[PDB]
């Protein structure tokens, strides 16, 4: 009852109040564009002739990804520094779509990424002899390796294991005293960096106290009066948010914060306003006339990519709210049906064409929007919850005598107080990373089971069946 | 017709280095003749760490083809430093770039690095540039973030005068007048009036409420104004009840009603509900949450249902 279909609701334009502006003009134009498409398309929930079918066109999307996977035109040079992202968007999408790569192709993926790895530490957006290490390519490369790699000598995981110390040193070189990280040498400082670093550090068991100092404060201070998070915060000789709450930066902030909550440091991490983050999150879901897709900023346009950035943050904000209420002492929190409808009806390329998913009608599909539309779709299809009982079960099976060599800190006392506290940290970080479960019977597949894609994990954004063997390898919990 | 760098005397002594992709890489890009050749020589230059005019020129060549090439931007800045180039000239060069590359992280960070280094006694000219920059794209995220850093950084150096703050608020007021739905401008107002260290926190609060309420009455369905109102009251721990009479009609300055203003306004209902919660009237608050969930904002049926149960 609490997730009404767009077709069951009244579609009306955002009221003008008799005061027109540039914003409203754009909004009205986008509303018409999305509405017409919904009007031309058959309601996915119904049991009509001439209407366009809204079924997920998985084979078209597979071909779209295949067409760009082995060769890209010269125009893509604008993404030359983001080729690890091109890998991630593709291999993650294929995972979601349930399409397996053969071992030969996976090996090619591994080979490509390993050439992006600098001996100095970290992955770049291209070969090490061409580009310097960067936090974002490092996230994208690591996740891609989790998806396409394995524990054989040509599986790449071995290479990551050996690179743990150097990757750590790269992270420490990026670290700023205020709690932020530069994305690369002399690079910019925002929560994208924090998020990517924390994911990798968590997955590879290279988290230390010196790495995390002030990281929580920098993130907390990014939360704006709206409830969401800006890109960064400024430390006045108090900390102040430097811009609007944004879907992308809200995702990175919520995820970063959540990753920090499983680190057993004292008075760590500094709290955020969970309820406000949840409110902002759910307020970004568009009205029926705009298909129920998410927007990334207040008074901006809905974009299929925020299905992941905003939608994917929903279960995280939700868990933080739950804990916050239990700290003092169920229906869905966003419209899971409408979001799926936006994806099926509006975000898919028109049928019988190039395939792929897009930002909005009128926008070309691309790898980035394909990956993020599908990731968001997954979150809406599957009720993902972080389970304390699952975390407990994980604690009980954890073997602290097994594990890779501890990273050596840059500062003598920058490491854990002692082996006991280190192993306790290892257990907590590992147990919580594997705490996300799919609630049985919580599945909602709009349009029928043929539309079902696989289940991505909140925070990490890789399939659970990829996450577990991967993190278990680096923690030696296989 | 493109002249290969291998045929150029200025580069004769340099041995180009090929991209090390490895065997049969995935997602390979078919680089144009120009781009590949430029990177072949950039690899050689960077590997030997040459800091010269020709290397500097080469970096400009490369970033024009790929404004997101962070490796080359990093190298370029180190070239500007080592060669002791005019940073003011470089900044002027960035004025051409910023035009067509408004959403390049690298261009904006480069500009930040330049102004941090130049460190002018009065950044008024840069501030005015940024203002003019926002005219063709008033919601450019990078630009707003940059404007924040600019005022923040130079204020810590005590280089922002009271007249300067005043003119900035004037400018922000004009931005919101042109488009009251520009959430970016609202964000800037919040920094100018609330979050910045030098914000006036007195009567001042009363003036702000007047502005906010008038904004709401101008555009009752403006989500930006509502978020600002709620954030404001929450930040300064101010009760909602006393202001309620100004919002009640949508379910201190009062409403009119403007044409095309369907009732009720969802966010007005949220205000009324939170008002009841403030009055310890949990059942009345639950009833309005239920209405939001069932009739007036059904897209968020689940969330409002959540808020309803939070009362019981």
């Amino acid at each position: 009852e609490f997730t009404p279909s767009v077709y069951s609701l009244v579609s009306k334009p955002l009221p003008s109040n008799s005061r027109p502006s540039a914003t409203l003009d754009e909004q009205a134009e986008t509303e018409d564009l999305i509405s017409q498409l919904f009007d031309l398309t058959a309601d996915p929930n119904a049991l009509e002739h001439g209407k366009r079918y809204s079924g997920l066109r998985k084979q078209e999307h597979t071909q779209f990804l295949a067409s760009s996977f082995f060769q890209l035109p010269g125009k893509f040079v604008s993404l030359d520094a983001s080729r690890p992202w091109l890998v991630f968007w593709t291999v993650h999408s294929l995972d979601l779509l349930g399409v397996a790569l053969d071992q030969g192709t996976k090996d090619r993926v591994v080979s490509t990424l390993l050439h992006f790895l600098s001996p100095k530490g970290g992955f770049g957006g291209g070969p090490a002899n061409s580009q310097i290490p960067h936090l974002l390519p490092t996230y994208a490369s690591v996740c891609s390796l989790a998806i396409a790699g394995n524990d054989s000598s040509t599986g790449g995981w071995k290479d990551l294991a050996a690179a743990r110390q150097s990757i750590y040193e790269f992270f420490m070189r990026c670290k700023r005293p205020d709690g932020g990280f530069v994305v690369c040498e002399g690079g910019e400082v925002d929560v994208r960096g924090t998020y990517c670093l924390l994911v990798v550090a968590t997955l590879l068991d290279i988290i230390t106290p010196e790495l995390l100092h002030n990281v929580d404060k920098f993130v907390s201070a990014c939360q704006t009066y709206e409830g969401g998070f800006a890109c960064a915060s400024f430390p006045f000789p108090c900390r102040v948010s430097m811009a609007e709450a944004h879907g992308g930066y809200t995702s990175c902030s919520l995820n970063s914060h959540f990753l920090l909550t499983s680190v057993p440091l004292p008075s760590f991490p500094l709290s955020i306003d969970a309820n406000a983050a949840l409110r902002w999150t759910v307020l970004q879901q568009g009205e029926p006339i705009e298909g129920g897709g998410f927007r990334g900023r207040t008074n901006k346009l809905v974009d299929g990519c925020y299905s992941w950035w905003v939608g994917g943050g929903a279960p995280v904000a939700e868990e933080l709210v739950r804990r916050e209420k239990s700290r003092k002492v169920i229906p869905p929190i966003f419209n899971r049906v409408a979001l799926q409808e936006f994806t099926l009806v509006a975000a898919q390329q028109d049928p019988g064409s190039t395939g792929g998913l897009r930002d909005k009608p009128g926008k070309r599909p691309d790898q980035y929007h394909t990956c993020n539309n599908l990731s968001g779709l997954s979150i809406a299809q599957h009720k993902m919850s972080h389970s304390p009982s699952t975390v407990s079960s994980n604690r009980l099976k954890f073997d602290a005598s097994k594990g890779l060599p501890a990273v050596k800190p840059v500062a003598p006392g920058g490491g854990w107080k002692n082996e006991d506290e280190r192993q306790n940290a290892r257990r907590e970080i590992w147990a919580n990373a594997l705490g996300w479960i799919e609630e049985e019977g919580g599945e909602i597949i709009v349009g029928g089971k043929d539309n079902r894609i696989n289940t991505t994990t909140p925070v990490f954004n890789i399939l659970g069946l990829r996450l577990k063997p991967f993190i278990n390898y680096f923690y030696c919990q296989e | 017709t493109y002249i290969p760098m291998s045929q150029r005397r200025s580069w004769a002594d340099v041995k180009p280095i090929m991209q090390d992709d490895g065997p049969n890489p995935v997602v390979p890009i078919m680089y144009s003749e120009e781009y590949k050749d430029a990177m072949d020589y950039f690899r050689a230059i960077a590997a030997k760490e040459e800091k010269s005019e020709r290397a500097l020129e080469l970096t400009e060549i490369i970033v024009r083809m790929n404004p997101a090439h962070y490796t080359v931007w990093q190298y370029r800045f180190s070239l500007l430093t080592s060669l002791n180039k005019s940073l003011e000239d470089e900044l002027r060069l960035m004025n051409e770039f910023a035009v067509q590359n408004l959403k390049s992280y690298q261009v904006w960070h480069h500009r930040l690095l330049l102004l941090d280094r130049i460190s002018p006694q009065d950044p008024v000219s840069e501030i005015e540039y940024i203002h003019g920059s926002l005219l063709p794209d008033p919601k450019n995220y990078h630009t707003w973030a940059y404007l924040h850093w600019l005022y923040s950084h130079f204020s810590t150096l005590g280089r922002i005068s009271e007249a300067q703050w005043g003119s900035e608020l004037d400018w922000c007021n004009e931005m919101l007048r042109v488009d009251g739905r520009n959430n970016s401008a609202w964000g800037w107002r919040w920094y100018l009036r609330v979050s910045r260290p030098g914000a006036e926190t007195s009567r001042s609060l009363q003036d702000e409420l007047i502005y906010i309420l008038k904004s709401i009455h101008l555009i009752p369905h403006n989500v930006s104004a509502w978020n600002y109102l709620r954030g404001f009251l929450k930040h300064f721990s101010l009760p909602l009840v006393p202001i309620l009479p100004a919002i009640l009609p949508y379910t201190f300055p009062m409403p009119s009603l403007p044409e095309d203003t369907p009732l009720p306004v969802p966010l007005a209902l949220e205000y009324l509900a939170d008002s009841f919660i403030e009055q310890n009237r949990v059942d009345d608050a639950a009833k309005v949450f239920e209405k939001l969930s069932s009739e007036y904002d059904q897209m968020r049926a689940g969330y409002w249902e959540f808020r309803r149960r939070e009362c019981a």
Binding site: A81, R358, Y368 | S104
Partner: peptide, 9 residues
């Protein structure tokens, strides 16, 4: 028909 401008890096 028009390319999307969603840059994350």
């Amino acid at each position: 028909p028009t390319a999307s401008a969603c840059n994350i890096q």
